[PDB]
Design a protein around this ligand. Structure first.
Ligand code: SF4
Length: 224
C-alpha cells in the first residue's frame, strides 16, 4: 500500500473510533506522556489508570518526583511488576531536574539519554506531547506493519529492525502525527491482535498482504 494512503486511512479510522479520553491525553505534557509510556510498557491500560492517577496526585511535577525518596516511589509502584522500570523512572526525573532545570528536554538525543527511555519511547514522548515528527515501533506497531507489508524475519535481528523502522518512518505523517501514533497503538492492541486478528474491523484490510493470503501467523517472525 502507498504510504500516503496508509496514513490517510488510519487517520480517518482514528477520527471515528480512536481512543482520545485516557488521562494522559487530556491536557497532555511531556511528563504525563513519559510517565504513562513507562507504566504501559509491560502492563495493560485498565491496570495502569489508577496508578497513573495516584502518581500525578502525589507528584504533580517531575521535580516533585525527583525530590522524593526512592522507597516512596517503589511503594507506590507495588503491583505493577518489573521494578527496574521504577528505579529508572526516578533516575530520569533526577536527570531532568539536574540537567534541564526541571523542564523536559525537547530534542531527541536529550530525551533518549534518559535512563529507561529507548528510541521508540523517546519518539512517543516528543510526537504525542509536542507534535514533533518522529515514528514509533513498539510491539503493537511492529505487528501491524509486519502484517500489512509482509515483513518476515525476527525483529531482534538488526537488518529486520532497520527495515521496520524505515517502514514506520515512511507511513508516519507530520500533519496529524499525534493522532496517527496513538491510532497505530490502538490498532495493534484491539484489532490486529496476536491471535486471530479482526481484519473485518481494520482500516488497512483493503491493502494488507497478510489479510489477502490469510497469513497473519507469519508476521512478525519469531525467534529461531
Ligand atoms: S488487515 Fe488484519 S492482519 Fe492486516 S493489519 Fe489489519 S488486522 Fe492486521
Amino acid at each position: 500500500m502507498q504510504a500516503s494512503q496508509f496514513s490517510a486511512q488510519v487517520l480517518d479510522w482514528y477520527d471515528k473510533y480512536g481512543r482520545k479520553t485516557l488521562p494522559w491525553q487530556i491536557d497532555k505534557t511531556p511528563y504525563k506522556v513519559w510517565l504513562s509510556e513507562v507504566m504501559l510498557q509491560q502492563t495493560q491500560v485498565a491496570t495502569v489508570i489508577p496508578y497513573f492517577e495516584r502518581f500525578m496526585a502525589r507528584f504533580p511535577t517531575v521535580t516533585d518526583l525527583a525530590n522524593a525518596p526512592l522507597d516512596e516511589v517503589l511503594h507506590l509502584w507495588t503491583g505493577l511488576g518489573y521494578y527496574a522500570r521504577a528505579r529508572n523512572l526516578h533516575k530520569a526525573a533526577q536527570q531532568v531536574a539536574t540537567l534541564h532545570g526541571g523542564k523536559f528536554p525537547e530534542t531527541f538525543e536529550e530525551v533518549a539519554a534518559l535512563p529507561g527511555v529507548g528510541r521508540s519511547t523517546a519518539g512517543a514522548i516528543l510526537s504525542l506531547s509536542l507534535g514533533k515528527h518522529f515514528p514509533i515501533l513498539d510491539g503493537n506497531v511492529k505487528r501491524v506493519l509486519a502484517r500489512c507489508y509482509a515483513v518476515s524475519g525476527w525483529p531482534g535481528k538488526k537488518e529486520v529492525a532497520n527495515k521496520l523502522w524505515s517502514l514506520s518512518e515512511q507511513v508516519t505523517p507530520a500533519v496529524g502525527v499525534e493522532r496517527f501514533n496513538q491510532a497505530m497503538m490502538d490498532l495493534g492492541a484491539m484489532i490486529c491482535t496476536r491471535s486471530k486478528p479482526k481484519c473485518s474491523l481494520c482500516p488497512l484490510q483493503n491493502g494488507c498482504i497478510a489479510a489477502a493470503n490469510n497469513s497473519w501467523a507469519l508476521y512478525p517472525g519469531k525467534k529461531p
